[PDB]
Amino acid sequence: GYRPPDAFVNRIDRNIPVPARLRHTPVSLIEAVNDFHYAMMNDEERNNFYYEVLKKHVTPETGVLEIGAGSGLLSLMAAKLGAKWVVAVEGSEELAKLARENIRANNMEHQVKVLHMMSTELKPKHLPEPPDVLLSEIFGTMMLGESALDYVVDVRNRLLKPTTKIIPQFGTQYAVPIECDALHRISSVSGWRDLDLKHMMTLQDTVSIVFAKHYGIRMNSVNFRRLSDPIELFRVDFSSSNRNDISRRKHFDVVAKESGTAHAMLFYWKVTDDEFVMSTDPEDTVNNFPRDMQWGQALQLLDASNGPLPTPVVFTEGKNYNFECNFSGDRVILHMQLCPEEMTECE
Amino acid sequence: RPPDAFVNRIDRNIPVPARLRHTPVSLIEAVNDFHYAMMNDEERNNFYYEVLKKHVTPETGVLEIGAGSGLLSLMAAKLGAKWVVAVEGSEELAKLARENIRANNMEHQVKVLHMMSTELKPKHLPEPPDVLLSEIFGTMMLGESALDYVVDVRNRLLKPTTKIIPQFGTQYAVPIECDALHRISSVSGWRDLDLKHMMTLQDTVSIVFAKHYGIRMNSVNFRRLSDPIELFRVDFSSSNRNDISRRKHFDVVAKESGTAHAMLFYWKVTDDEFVMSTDPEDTVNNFPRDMQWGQALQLLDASNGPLPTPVVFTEGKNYNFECNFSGDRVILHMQLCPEMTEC
Ligand SMILES: Nc1ncnc2c1ncn2[C@@H]1O[C@H](CSCC[C@H](N)C(=O)O)[C@@H](O)[C@H]1O
Ligand SMILES: Nc1ncnc2c1ncn2[C@@H]1O[C@H](CSCC[C@H](N)C(=O)O)[C@@H](O)[C@H]1O
């Protein structure tokens, strides 16, 4: 017999039993589905979001194009609503097949087609015509975390026609300074009785954006306080915006509603199309448990200045606080640095 | 600027404090991901403090495997040990420990060696130690080979009278029903759309840490379908990994009827009267422990069909499970025995 180099069994001790359905299946595909896709599909509210927005844009003469088909659920929705043709693009090989198999298992093998490629190499030749609708779910815990704006923009410039409706329409990344003792106990140490340990603080990570779930935390489960109104880091119109519409450095003047300790900046985002909303805000994901597991929220520990040891950002209600937001080149990573009163070039 | 410097993996536009710029990334990741949480697990710290002060004389020489930050050695020194030698494999962690030791003026009580305990020879020690101190437990108790590393030191460096801390370790397992976990790990479909083919890929083999699902078991609602399954127990002063059979079987009687979505894995460490538990029923107020360890999970498939079959419990009936250990006993797997298995 033969075993693919990336077969699941290869990752597993000889003494441990593996079901035939898993043995020769590629590790990455298994990891992809088990870690993300199962949680995505049980995000009913997410599925309901895309079904409703498609429902008001799909005619039997509607040509649909989806970026990142994965399992093909969204592409199935387009066809389910009676679309003329659906072409779904998927970057990895094994996800491409899995989509097709889901497409045969259901009705739509004639209606929906899945191309193995990145949307970057998708050419007008690969499409029947310019699509009426562009479909996309390529949002991460950070909205542009998996470069959603860049992939749509490339496709928007090359493959779409004027009348093309882009789903979804709007996207906004928010930031909130929060007090959260529970998080603080995971990320800070002073000492144990007589023993001084504050030197450990030399190493505290004030720079990295961190996904709540990866370190075992769900903000809906943890008690915390929002020390201010949401901060609109940036808005994006997917049918007109570019990644340079997001200035690589911005300054935000935040008014503290409540006094407390800003242990961390909490990062969430909302996606809008007409009256329909996709929210990453923990207030809206209380009952959407699968969403907190797929997207969740992101955190960044705040340091007030550049001392040898981190300085706590203490908010005093009514008093005003100034933050410098620095994006990376691809606008995929960002950072919130409190302005002093010389890491920042605040003025 | 070291090749492993923290700045070097950060965008040029993002600001990095001087205390972090030239610091090795691995050190930062380690301290931030684990050490902070360890140090705020005060039950854990209190566990070792109480077991230590029961054995530490001003005549007691202490040897710690895996110093890391070296807090436990600071405890042994604080309790007035005559000499403490703490061994640490990470070069950057070893220096971090030394600094903590200077900050508490115990520079001459505690010595930190940059090596693996495998390389620790009697030459490196003043005397065969009176006390052996270890914290090398993972979310899976033997997940970090805590048993093997102690056995090597036990065979080569210790003396008959050497008290090993901690004494006992028990790896438990419980079959549980958990609707929240099920929604994260399975899919049937969406309305008329059938997505059951997705189930072909459901990972039934891998042991996944609960926090890597993003889950803390104390926050999520679940049912235990039977009494705890003692997979194995180890005496760190006499057991070898060969004492753990490569394959064990278990008569598991269902206390309750339900769906065994998964096998929950926790453990308990014992020394005299003192207990270190990973059971989520004991970590309800120990939020740092659930973050540094938490629990483990394995999804259960009942047989070997083209699709996963739910393991369903009927109260009062028996369910035989086969447990297979990897060679180093670091990894294990629970498989239901049908009326892949040797049963
Ligand atoms: N430029 C790109 N081109 C094609 N596929 C992409 C892509 N970027 C990400 N992807 C793929 O899109 C998927 C993101 S999630 C899958 C969404 C799917 N339509 C659903 O709702 O079920 C991943 O599988 C990823 O491999
Ligand atoms: N055989 C081994 N020998 C020496 N150090 C080890 C080791 N196995 C693991 N370690 C190290 O021990 C540490 C495990 S965690 C440190 C726990 C420490 N007692 C404290 O509470 O601060 C890690 O730094 C690891 O690199």
Coordinates of N, CA and C in Angstrom, one line a residue, chain A residues 8 11-13 15-22 25 29-30 33-34 37-39 41-42 44 47-48 51 71 73 76-77 80 98 101-102 106 108 182-183 185-189 192-197 199-208 213-217 221-222 248-249 287 289-290 293 303 306-310 326-329 333-335 337 343, chain B residues 6 10-21 23 27-28 31-33 35-37 39-40 45-46 49 69 71 74-75 78 96 99-100 103-104 106 180 183-187 190-195 197-206 211-216 219-220 246 285 287-288 291 301 304-308 324-327 331-333 340:
Chain A
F8 N -2.3 11.2 8.6 CA -2.6 11.4 10.1 C -1.8 10.4 10.9
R11 N 1.6 11.0 12.5 CA 1.7 11.8 13.6 C 1.4 11.1 14.9
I12 N 1.2 9.8 14.8 CA 0.7 9.0 16.0 C 1.5 7.8 16.3
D13 N 1.8 7.6 17.6 CA 2.5 6.4 18.1 C 1.9 5.1 17.6
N15 N 1.4 2.4 19.0 CA 0.5 1.7 19.9 C -0.9 2.3 20.0
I16 N -1.1 3.4 19.3 CA -2.4 4.1 19.4 C -3.2 3.9 18.1
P17 N -4.5 3.4 18.3 CA -5.4 3.0 17.2 C -6.0 4.2 16.5
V18 N -6.0 4.1 15.1 CA -6.6 5.2 14.3 C -7.7 4.6 13.3
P19 N -8.9 5.2 13.3 CA -9.9 4.8 12.4 C -9.6 5.0 11.0
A20 N -9.9 4.0 10.1 CA -9.6 4.0 8.7 C -10.0 5.3 8.0
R21 N -11.0 6.0 8.5 CA -11.5 7.3 8.0 C -10.5 8.4 8.2
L22 N -9.5 8.2 9.1 CA -8.5 9.2 9.4 C -7.1 8.9 8.9
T25 N -5.7 10.3 5.7 CA -6.1 11.7 5.5 C -5.0 12.7 5.9
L29 N -5.5 19.1 6.8 CA -7.0 19.1 6.6 C -7.7 18.7 7.8
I30 N -7.3 17.7 8.5 CA -7.9 17.2 9.7 C -7.8 18.3 10.8
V33 N -10.2 21.4 9.8 CA -11.6 21.1 10.1 C -11.9 21.0 11.6
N34 N -11.2 20.3 12.3 CA -11.4 20.1 13.8 C -11.1 21.4 14.6
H37 N -13.5 24.8 11.4 CA -14.7 24.7 10.5 C -15.9 24.2 11.3
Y38 N -15.8 23.2 12.2 CA -16.8 22.7 13.0 C -17.5 23.8 13.8
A39 N -16.6 24.7 14.3 CA -17.1 25.9 15.1 C -17.8 26.9 14.3
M41 N -19.5 26.3 11.5 CA -20.8 25.9 11.0 C -21.9 25.9 12.0
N42 N -21.4 25.9 13.3 CA -22.4 25.9 14.4 C -22.7 27.4 14.8
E44 N -24.7 29.6 14.0 CA -26.0 29.7 13.3 C -26.2 31.2 12.9
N47 N -24.1 32.0 9.9 CA -24.8 31.3 8.8 C -26.1 32.1 8.4
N48 N -26.8 32.4 9.4 CA -28.1 33.2 9.2 C -27.8 34.6 8.7
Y51 N -27.0 34.0 4.9 CA -28.2 33.5 4.2 C -29.1 34.7 3.9
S71 N -15.4 24.7 3.3 CA -16.4 23.6 3.2 C -17.4 23.8 2.1
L73 N -20.2 25.8 2.5 CA -21.5 26.1 3.1 C -22.1 27.4 2.5
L76 N -23.1 26.9 -1.0 CA -24.3 26.1 -1.0 C -25.6 27.0 -0.8
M77 N -25.4 28.0 0.0 CA -26.5 29.0 0.3 C -26.9 29.7 -1.0
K80 N -28.6 27.3 -3.2 CA -29.9 27.0 -2.5 C -31.0 28.1 -2.8
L98 N -13.0 18.5 -0.2 CA -14.0 18.4 0.8 C -15.3 19.2 0.5
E101 N -17.2 17.4 -2.3 CA -17.9 16.2 -1.8 C -19.1 16.6 -1.0
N102 N -19.1 17.7 -0.3 CA -20.3 18.3 0.3 C -21.3 18.8 -0.8
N106 N -25.0 17.0 -1.4 CA -26.2 17.7 -1.7 C -26.4 17.8 -3.2
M108 N -26.2 20.3 -5.3 CA -25.6 21.3 -6.3 C -24.3 21.0 -7.1
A182 N -8.9 39.0 36.6 CA -8.7 37.6 36.3 C -7.6 37.5 35.2
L183 N -7.6 38.3 34.2 CA -6.5 38.4 33.2 C -5.2 38.8 33.9
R185 N -4.2 38.3 36.9 CA -3.5 37.2 37.6 C -2.8 36.2 36.7
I186 N -3.1 36.2 35.5 CA -2.4 35.3 34.5 C -1.2 36.0 33.9
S187 N -1.1 37.3 34.0 CA -0.1 38.0 33.3 C 0.8 38.9 34.2
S188 N 0.6 38.9 35.5 CA 1.4 39.7 36.4 C 1.7 38.9 37.7
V189 N 2.8 39.3 38.3 CA 3.3 38.7 39.5 C 4.1 39.8 40.3
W192 N 5.8 36.3 46.3 CA 5.2 35.3 47.2 C 5.7 35.4 48.6
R193 N 4.9 36.1 49.5 CA 5.4 36.4 50.8 C 6.6 37.3 50.8
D194 N 7.6 36.9 51.6 CA 8.9 37.7 51.7 C 9.6 37.7 50.3
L195 N 9.4 36.7 49.5 CA 10.1 36.5 48.3 C 9.6 37.6 47.3
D196 N 10.6 38.4 46.8 CA 10.3 39.4 45.8 C 10.4 38.8 44.4
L197 N 9.4 39.0 43.5 CA 9.4 38.4 42.2 C 9.2 39.5 41.1
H199 N 10.9 41.2 39.5 CA 11.8 41.2 38.4 C 11.2 40.4 37.2
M200 N 10.3 39.5 37.5 CA 9.6 38.8 36.4 C 8.9 39.7 35.5
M201 N 8.5 40.9 36.0 CA 7.7 41.9 35.2 C 8.5 42.5 34.1
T202 N 9.9 42.3 34.2 CA 10.8 42.8 33.1 C 10.3 42.2 31.8
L203 N 9.7 41.1 31.8 CA 9.4 40.3 30.6 C 8.0 40.3 30.1
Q204 N 7.1 41.0 30.8 CA 5.7 41.1 30.5 C 5.5 41.6 29.0
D205 N 4.6 40.9 28.3 CA 4.4 41.2 26.9 C 3.3 42.2 26.7
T206 N 3.8 43.5 26.4 CA 2.9 44.6 26.3 C 2.7 44.9 24.8
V207 N 3.5 44.3 24.0 CA 3.4 44.5 22.5 C 2.4 43.6 21.8
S208 N 2.5 42.3 22.1 CA 1.8 41.3 21.3 C 0.2 41.4 21.4
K213 N -9.0 33.1 23.3 CA -9.2 31.6 23.4 C -7.9 30.8 23.4
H214 N -6.9 31.2 22.7 CA -5.6 30.5 22.7 C -5.0 30.3 24.0
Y215 N -5.2 31.2 24.9 CA -4.8 31.1 26.3 C -5.9 30.8 27.2
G216 N -6.9 30.2 26.7 CA -8.0 29.6 27.5 C -9.1 30.4 28.1
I217 N -9.2 31.7 27.6 CA -10.1 32.7 28.2 C -11.3 33.0 27.3
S221 N -17.2 34.7 30.0 CA -17.1 34.0 31.3 C -16.4 34.7 32.4
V222 N -15.5 35.6 32.0 CA -14.7 36.4 32.9 C -15.4 37.8 33.2
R248 N -1.2 54.2 8.6 CA -0.4 53.2 9.3 C -0.2 53.7 10.7
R249 N -0.4 54.9 11.0 CA -0.4 55.4 12.4 C -1.6 56.4 12.6
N287 N -24.7 34.3 24.0 CA -25.4 33.1 23.7 C -24.8 32.4 22.4
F289 N -22.0 30.9 21.7 CA -20.8 30.2 22.2 C -19.9 29.7 21.1
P290 N -20.5 29.2 20.0 CA -19.5 28.8 18.9 C -18.7 30.0 18.3
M293 N -15.6 30.8 20.2 CA -14.6 29.7 20.0 C -13.9 29.8 18.6
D303 N 1.2 49.1 28.8 CA 2.2 49.7 29.6 C 2.3 51.2 29.4
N306 N 8.0 53.6 29.3 CA 9.2 52.8 29.0 C 10.1 52.6 30.1
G307 N 9.6 52.3 31.3 CA 10.4 52.1 32.5 C 11.1 50.7 32.4
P308 N 12.0 50.4 33.3 CA 12.6 49.1 33.4 C 11.6 48.0 33.6
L309 N 10.5 48.4 34.3 CA 9.4 47.6 34.6 C 8.1 48.2 34.1
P310 N 7.1 47.4 33.7 CA 5.9 47.9 33.1 C 5.2 48.9 34.1
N326 N -0.4 51.9 16.1 CA 0.5 51.6 15.0 C 0.1 50.3 14.3
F327 N -0.1 50.4 13.0 CA -0.4 49.2 12.2 C 0.9 48.7 11.5
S328 N 0.9 47.4 11.2 CA 1.9 46.9 10.4 C 1.7 47.2 8.9
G329 N 2.6 46.9 8.0 CA 2.5 47.2 6.6 C 1.2 46.7 6.0
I333 N -1.5 43.5 11.7 CA -1.2 43.6 13.1 C -1.3 45.1 13.5
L334 N -1.7 45.3 14.8 CA -1.7 46.7 15.3 C -1.2 46.7 16.7
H335 N -1.1 48.0 17.3 CA -0.7 48.1 18.7 C -1.2 49.4 19.3
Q337 N -0.3 52.1 22.1 CA 0.6 52.6 23.1 C 0.1 53.9 23.7
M343 N 8.6 56.2 23.0 CA 8.1 55.1 22.1 C 7.2 55.8 21.0
Chain B
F6 N 13.5 39.7 20.6 CA 12.1 39.9 20.5 C 11.7 40.9 19.5
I10 N 8.9 41.5 15.2 CA 7.9 42.5 15.3 C 8.1 43.6 14.3
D11 N 6.9 44.1 13.7 CA 6.9 45.1 12.7 C 7.7 46.3 13.1
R12 N 8.4 46.9 12.2 CA 9.3 48.0 12.5 C 8.6 49.2 13.0
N13 N 7.3 49.3 12.7 CA 6.5 50.5 13.1 C 5.9 50.4 14.5
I14 N 5.8 49.2 15.0 CA 5.3 48.9 16.4 C 6.4 49.1 17.4
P15 N 6.1 49.9 18.5 CA 7.0 50.2 19.5 C 7.3 49.1 20.5
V16 N 8.6 48.8 20.8 CA 9.0 47.8 21.8 C 9.8 48.4 22.9
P17 N 9.4 48.3 24.1 CA 10.1 48.8 25.3 C 11.5 48.2 25.4
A18 N 12.4 49.0 26.0 CA 13.8 48.6 26.1 C 14.0 47.3 26.9
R19 N 13.1 47.0 27.9 CA 13.2 45.8 28.7 C 12.9 44.6 27.9
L20 N 12.4 44.7 26.6 CA 12.0 43.6 25.8 C 12.8 43.4 24.5
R21 N 13.4 44.5 24.1 CA 14.0 44.6 22.7 C 15.0 43.5 22.4
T23 N 15.7 40.9 24.5 CA 15.4 39.6 25.2 C 14.9 38.5 24.2
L27 N 12.2 33.0 25.8 CA 12.1 33.3 27.2 C 10.8 34.1 27.5
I28 N 10.5 35.1 26.7 CA 9.3 35.9 26.8 C 8.1 35.0 26.7
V31 N 7.7 32.7 29.9 CA 7.4 33.4 31.1 C 5.9 33.9 31.0
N32 N 5.6 34.5 29.9 CA 4.2 35.0 29.7 C 3.1 33.9 29.6
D33 N 3.5 32.8 28.9 CA 2.5 31.8 28.7 C 2.2 30.9 29.9
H35 N 4.7 30.8 33.3 CA 5.3 31.1 34.6 C 4.5 32.1 35.4
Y36 N 3.9 33.1 34.8 CA 3.1 34.1 35.5 C 1.9 33.3 36.2
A37 N 1.3 32.4 35.4 CA 0.2 31.6 35.9 C 0.6 30.7 37.0
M39 N 2.9 31.1 39.2 CA 3.2 31.9 40.4 C 2.0 32.4 41.0
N40 N 0.9 32.5 40.3 CA -0.4 32.9 40.9 C -1.3 31.8 41.3
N45 N 1.7 26.7 45.1 CA 2.8 27.2 45.9 C 2.7 26.7 47.3
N46 N 1.5 26.9 47.9 CA 1.2 26.4 49.3 C 1.4 24.9 49.4
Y49 N 5.2 24.4 49.7 CA 5.7 25.0 50.9 C 5.5 24.2 52.1
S69 N 11.8 29.6 36.9 CA 12.0 30.9 37.6 C 12.7 30.6 39.0
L71 N 11.3 29.6 41.9 CA 10.5 29.9 43.1 C 10.5 28.9 44.2
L74 N 13.7 29.0 46.1 CA 13.6 30.1 47.0 C 12.8 29.7 48.3
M75 N 11.8 28.7 48.1 CA 11.1 28.2 49.2 C 12.0 27.4 50.1
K78 N 14.3 29.6 51.9 CA 13.6 30.4 52.9 C 13.3 29.5 54.1
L96 N 17.4 33.9 34.7 CA 16.3 34.6 35.3 C 16.2 34.1 36.8
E99 N 18.8 35.7 39.0 CA 18.4 37.1 39.3 C 17.4 37.2 40.4
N100 N 16.4 36.3 40.4 CA 15.4 36.2 41.4 C 16.1 35.9 42.7
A103 N 17.9 38.9 44.2 CA 16.9 39.9 44.6 C 16.4 39.5 46.0
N104 N 16.6 38.3 46.4 CA 16.2 37.8 47.7 C 17.4 37.5 48.6
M106 N 19.7 35.4 48.5 CA 20.0 34.0 48.8 C 21.0 33.5 47.8
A180 N -21.8 21.8 24.9 CA -20.9 22.9 24.3 C -19.8 22.4 23.5
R183 N -20.9 21.0 20.1 CA -21.2 22.0 19.1 C -19.9 22.5 18.4
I184 N -18.8 22.4 19.1 CA -17.5 22.8 18.6 C -16.8 21.7 17.8
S185 N -17.2 20.5 18.1 CA -16.5 19.3 17.5 C -17.3 18.5 16.5
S186 N -18.6 18.9 16.3 CA -19.4 18.2 15.4 C -20.3 19.1 14.6
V187 N -20.8 18.6 13.5 CA -21.7 19.3 12.6 C -22.6 18.2 11.9
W190 N -27.0 22.3 8.0 CA -27.7 23.6 8.2 C -28.9 23.6 7.3
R191 N -30.1 23.5 8.0 CA -31.4 23.3 7.3 C -31.3 22.1 6.4
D192 N -31.7 22.3 5.1 CA -31.8 21.1 4.2 C -30.4 20.7 3.7
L193 N -29.4 21.6 3.9 CA -28.0 21.3 3.5 C -27.4 20.2 4.4
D194 N -26.9 19.1 3.8 CA -26.3 18.1 4.6 C -24.8 18.2 4.7
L195 N -24.3 18.3 5.9 CA -22.9 18.5 6.1 C -22.3 17.3 6.9
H197 N -20.9 14.7 6.0 CA -19.7 14.2 5.4 C -18.5 14.9 6.1
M198 N -18.7 16.0 6.7 CA -17.7 16.7 7.5 C -17.2 15.9 8.7
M199 N -18.1 15.1 9.1 CA -17.9 14.2 10.3 C -16.9 13.2 10.0
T200 N -16.6 12.9 8.8 CA -15.6 11.9 8.4 C -14.2 12.2 9.0
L201 N -14.0 13.5 9.2 CA -12.7 14.0 9.7 C -12.6 14.3 11.2
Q202 N -13.6 13.9 11.9 CA -13.6 14.3 13.4 C -12.5 13.6 14.1
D203 N -11.6 14.4 14.8 CA -10.5 13.8 15.4 C -10.9 13.1 16.7
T204 N -10.6 11.8 16.7 CA -11.1 10.9 17.7 C -9.8 10.3 18.4
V205 N -8.7 10.6 17.9 CA -7.4 10.1 18.4 C -6.7 11.1 19.3
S206 N -6.5 12.3 18.8 CA -5.7 13.3 19.5 C -6.2 13.7 20.9
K211 N -8.0 24.1 27.0 CA -7.8 25.5 26.7 C -7.5 25.8 25.2
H212 N -7.1 24.8 24.5 CA -6.8 24.9 23.1 C -8.1 24.7 22.3
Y213 N -9.2 24.3 22.9 CA -10.5 24.4 22.3 C -11.0 25.8 22.7
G214 N -10.4 26.5 23.6 CA -10.8 27.8 24.1 C -11.7 27.6 25.3
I215 N -11.7 26.4 25.8 CA -12.7 26.0 26.9 C -12.0 25.9 28.3
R216 N -12.7 26.4 29.3 CA -12.5 26.1 30.7 C -13.6 25.3 31.2
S219 N -16.4 26.7 33.5 CA -17.4 27.6 32.9 C -18.4 27.0 32.1
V220 N -18.0 25.8 31.5 CA -18.9 25.1 30.6 C -19.7 24.0 31.4
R246 N 1.6 -1.2 28.9 CA 1.5 -0.5 27.7 C 0.0 -0.4 27.2
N285 N -12.1 27.9 42.0 CA -11.6 29.2 42.5 C -10.1 29.3 42.1
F287 N -8.5 29.8 39.2 CA -8.4 30.2 37.9 C -7.0 30.2 37.2
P288 N -5.9 30.5 38.0 CA -4.6 30.4 37.4 C -4.2 28.9 37.1
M291 N -5.5 27.7 33.8 CA -4.8 28.4 32.7 C -3.5 27.8 32.4
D301 N -15.0 7.8 19.7 CA -15.7 7.1 18.6 C -16.0 5.7 19.0
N304 N -15.4 1.6 14.2 CA -14.5 1.9 13.1 C -15.3 2.0 11.8
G305 N -16.4 2.6 11.8 CA -17.2 2.9 10.6 C -16.6 4.0 9.8
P306 N -17.2 4.3 8.6 CA -16.8 5.4 7.7 C -17.1 6.7 8.4
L307 N -17.9 6.7 9.4 CA -18.3 7.9 10.2 C -18.2 7.6 11.7
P308 N -18.0 8.7 12.5 CA -17.9 8.5 13.9 C -19.2 8.0 14.5
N324 N -4.4 2.6 25.5 CA -3.1 2.4 24.9 C -2.2 3.5 25.2
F325 N -1.0 3.2 25.8 CA 0.0 4.2 26.1 C 1.1 4.2 25.0
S326 N 1.6 5.3 24.7 CA 2.8 5.4 23.9 C 4.0 4.8 24.7
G327 N 5.1 4.6 24.0 CA 6.3 4.0 24.6 C 6.8 4.7 25.8
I331 N 1.9 9.9 25.9 CA 0.6 10.0 25.2 C -0.3 8.7 25.5
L332 N -1.6 8.9 25.6 CA -2.5 7.8 25.7 C -3.7 7.9 24.9
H333 N -4.5 6.9 24.8 CA -5.8 6.9 24.1 C -6.8 6.0 24.7
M340 N -9.7 -2.7 15.9 CA -8.8 -1.7 16.5 C -8.5 -2.1 17.9

